[PDB]
Design a protein around this ligand. Structure first.
Ligand code: 0BL
Ligand code: 0BL
Ligand code: CL
Ligand code: CL
Ligand code: MG
Ligand code: MG
Ligand code: MG
Ligand code: MG
Lengths: 6, 227, 227, 6
């Protein structure tokens, strides 16, 4: 799955 | 239930809850602080976002586990329980969207605050879209509109390395790839964002450079997965 | 609120909640199952224990963080929030103890079930003792009595390698070291338990051997820390 | 801190 902002 | 607590006490307790990893409590304290009606500072906006990101993150992880189990089974229990978790997730998203609409966005005049809240609006519509079926179309358009307004302001008012601008572009690219079935748009946005930030790193202090390159790494990681 | 759901459905949903890491839900489903009034199977006892161990474990970790912050500060916020978490922890412990007293322990005739529930009674009084101040003395005696009755039954009815017997002895040793200020008793119990189990490993299948040696490693680790 | 049962 794509990485979103931390 | 937080209406009787002082604003400053709610913020202090949100910081304690964060240290204790009590994210439901943290979100309740920050909802209480927002409902005092005053604008939030940068630190306070981050406390709000961290709290709800962690709450909804746990719900999303659980929904994905249950949805996977349900798909392989295709009694009513798996569906019923997935639906329960889905309803709770939708309720948290509706709570956040309600805080943004009443009245954080309309009172945010500065670009830093308005972009932050519009990005949040895009993110919480995106989480609704992950579980929607319709209805899905309307939710996707609401997410896209919020992210696009945030992008327009950020490109006019912030440098390409600004961490809020970078995190907005990152999340909008994820929206395009995972939600909107627009993988080429996702790749184009991530590439342009990365390259424009690279060319602006020379303007940054050592500390700002670390902030910006941290988010650029996530853009790079996605581009590697997507190509 | 679980009174309208079938027992079998509550158990199935507890298993799903475990996979989804939704431990509060898991505990609610298992409380509902206990309240149907039928005895629990070994698998079901384990679901009950896993659920509440995870719920109270998060509360204990948070209380320790907050208590540490409070001690270093010595406004009312840290104390108030530590007290809130403490009250919630005590309420969970009281819920578990109430299930054991109404009526799991009295209906448990077999050694495997009675020892399991008496160990749980010791554990949840131990968690109460961690936060008590008195009152503390009475709680400590309740924990000790439950653990000792469980030990007496386990030594008469189970082999030294039985995992329930081993986990009971492990937790009673922790009680002695951390709660009762009896470190020599803790070391003696852990050593005797370890040695008696070692001498019984030859009787076990490959799978049982793995179960028993796993818990023996925890006894060994504590002995290393304590000596 | 001492280790209890998993
Ligand atoms: C270094 C910052 C950074 C860079 C890139 C990506 C993420 C990120 O995050 C860090 C950070 O520090 N972001 C602001 C936060 S995060 C936070 C919290 N309590 N979780 C409190 C504050 C804050 C803001 C202004 C003034 C004081 C504190
Ligand atoms: C291998 C077992 C073991 C050995 C040593 C220490 C811990 C431990 O734990 C394992 C285990 O398997 N313990 C029983 C469990 S744990 C569980 C869960 N759902 N968390 C379900 C069941 C179970 C019991 C009887 C019949 C079917 C399932
Ligand atoms: Cl359900
Ligand atoms: Cl409080
Ligand atoms: Mg006031
Ligand atoms: Mg304003
Ligand atoms: Mg029935
Ligand atoms: Mg019986």
């Amino acid at each position: 799955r794509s990485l979103s902002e931390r | 239930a937080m209406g009787s607590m002082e604003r400053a006490s709610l913020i202090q307790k949100a910081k304690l809850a964060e240290q204790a990893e009590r994210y439901e409590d943290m979100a309740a304290f920050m909802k209480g602080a927002v409902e005092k009606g005053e604008e939030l500072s940068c630190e306070e906006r981050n406390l709000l976002s961290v709290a709800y990101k962690n709450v909804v993150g746990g719900q999303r992880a659980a929904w994905r586990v249950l949805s996977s189990i349900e798909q392989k089974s295709n009694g009513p229990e798996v569906r019923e329980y997935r639906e329960k978790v889905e309803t709770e997730l939708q309720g948290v998203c509706d709570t956040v969207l309600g805080l943004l609409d009443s009245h954080l966005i309309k009172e945010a005049g500065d670009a830093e605050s308005r972009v932050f809240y519009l990005k949040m609006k895009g993110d919480y519509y995106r989480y609704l879209a992950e579980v929607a079926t319709g209805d899905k179309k309307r939710i996707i358009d609401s997410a896209r509109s919020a992210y696009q307004e945030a992008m327009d302001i950020s490109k006019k008012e912030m440098p390409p390395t600004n961490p809020i601008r970078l995190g907005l572009a990152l999340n909008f690219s994820v929206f395009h790839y995972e939600i909107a079935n627009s993988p080429e748009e996702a790749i184009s946005l991530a590439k342009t964002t990365f390259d424009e930030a690279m060319a602006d790193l020379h303007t940054l202090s050592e500390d700002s450079y670390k902030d910006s390159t941290l988010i650029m790494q996530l853009l790079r990681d996605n581009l590697t997965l997507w190509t």
